[PDB]
């Protein structure tokens, strides 16, 4: 299993994999209980009022400012039972993802994607960037810094605004310079979106109530794909967008969709990113990797005592799949780069995960959300690592009946309709 322990929220802290921690938000916060579910990966069963000091209010200020696609509930994830279920739900989704070859590949890439040690102002020394760590309270009450790659945390005010968040740098664009940075995914396994089975209906803002439910494993995988791009520092600048001209409703409103999202969805959507720009990005990141190899060759000493310079140099040789010659000098192999870049951008996509999970899913990112449902995937009678909602040997096994919110109505509670409100 990906997660060796079946944590209970109330398990006593041990200062190792169950501990109170603080994140480097450059602000002041009270410690929150967190769980280390796998090497380099933690889960914080709390609403995210930490990564952004300006988003510490779980209440909707007015009642007309925010977009139609949003859902608020200041009380969600405030009790121990909710946190226990959150932890169990996230854990189960990680197992579901890990159970597929694609998920195993993605998670392996993520664990290997340690944020680059580029926080040194002296090119002769290798130094970690302190915002890619968390402060863990030890058994003696003292704090110890621990590097990590991923944190799954509860959503902020808007419960359904799932996304990857990471601490920036004063100069460097860590998610776009090949360096990478610790990723914080705002996510909840307790809700999911409803979509329509007919393309003409799903892509129309005036039709459909959301008959089928998106499998939350796909949603988390989608965010993990973003996390992968960001950990390897190859995320596409959000200013690079596609002025949607394939949907009259999108076009009539000048709606734009970032290339990063189209890339992440994959399938036909990725085709909207023209070849000339695609090559532009590839060359750009190729150079960024060259600079990392260059920086590694200049390193003559490591800062800290957590590991040896040789160990860290090897860690990044493996992450970026660099070539090592005679003098131990690093370089970027064109073939290896293209293969790694492609793995992270073309192999790991939402569309491919759908194929592996064998679930019904939106056919394109360019559609209109229909509704949001409350769910509970923790009970095996509701959802399993192997079949999601489409439980084998039951009336829910075929035709995605488990995802059919009308047939499997006991597993979904519609909280809000978005259709007609765009």
């Amino acid at each position: 299993p990906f997660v060796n322990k079946q944590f209970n929220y109330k398990d006593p802290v041990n200062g190792v994999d169950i501990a109170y921690i603080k994140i480097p938000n450059a602000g002041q916060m009270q410690p929150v209980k967190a769980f280390k579910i796998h090497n380099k990966i933690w889960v914080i069963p709390e609403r995210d009022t930490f990564t952004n000091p300006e988003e510490g209010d779980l209440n909707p200020p007015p009642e007309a400012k925010q977009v139609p696609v949003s859902y608020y509930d200041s009380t969600y994830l405030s009790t121990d039972n909710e946190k226990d279920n959150y932890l169990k739900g996230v854990t189960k989704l990680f197992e579901r993802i890990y159970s597929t070859d694609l998920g195993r590949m993605l998670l392996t890439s993520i664990v290997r994607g340690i944020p680059f040690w580029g926080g040194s102002t002296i090119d002769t020394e290798l130094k970690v960037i302190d915002t890619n760590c968390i402060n863990v309270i030890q058994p003696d009450g003292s704090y110890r810094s621990e590097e990590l790659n991923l944190v799954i945390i509860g959503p902020s005010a808007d419960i359904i605004q799932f996304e990857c968040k990471s601490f920036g740098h004063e100069v460097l664009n860590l998610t776009r310079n090949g360096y990478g940075s610790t990723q914080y995914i705002r996510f909840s396994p307790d809700f999911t979106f409803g979509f329509e089975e007919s393309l003409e209906v799903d892509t129309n803002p005036l039709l459909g109530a959301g008959k089928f439910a998106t499998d939350p494993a796909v949603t988390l995988a989608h965010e993990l794909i973003h996390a992968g791009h960001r950990l390897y520092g190859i995320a596409i600048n959000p200013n690079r967008v596609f002025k949607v001209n394939t949907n009259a409703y999108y076009e009539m409103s000048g709606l734009e969709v970032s290339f990063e999202e189209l890339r992440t969805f994959g399938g036909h959507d990725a085709k909207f990113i023209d070849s000339l720009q695609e090559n532009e990005f590839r060359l750009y990141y190729y150079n960024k990797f060259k600079d990392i190899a260059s920086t590694l060759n200049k390193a003559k000493s490591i800062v800290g005592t957590t590991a040896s310079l040789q160990y860290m140099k090897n860690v990044f040789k493996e992450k970026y799949l660099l070539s090592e010659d005679t003098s131990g000098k690093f370089s970027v192999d064109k073939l290896k780069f293209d293969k790694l870049y492609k793995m992270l951008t073309e192999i790991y996509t939402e569309d491919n995960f759908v194929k592996f999970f064998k679930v019904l899913n939106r056919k394109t990112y360019l559609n209109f959300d229909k509704a949001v449902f409350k769910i509970n995937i923790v009970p095996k009678v509701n959802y399993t690592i192997y079949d999601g909602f489409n439980l084998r040997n039951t009336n829910l096994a075929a035709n995605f009946n488990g995802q059919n919110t009308e047939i499997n109505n006991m597993n979904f509670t519609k909280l809000k309709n978005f259709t007609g409100l765009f």
Partner: peptide, 4 residues
């Protein structure tokens, strides 16, 4: 992000 799930998107619109």
């Amino acid at each position: 992000r799930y998107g619109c």
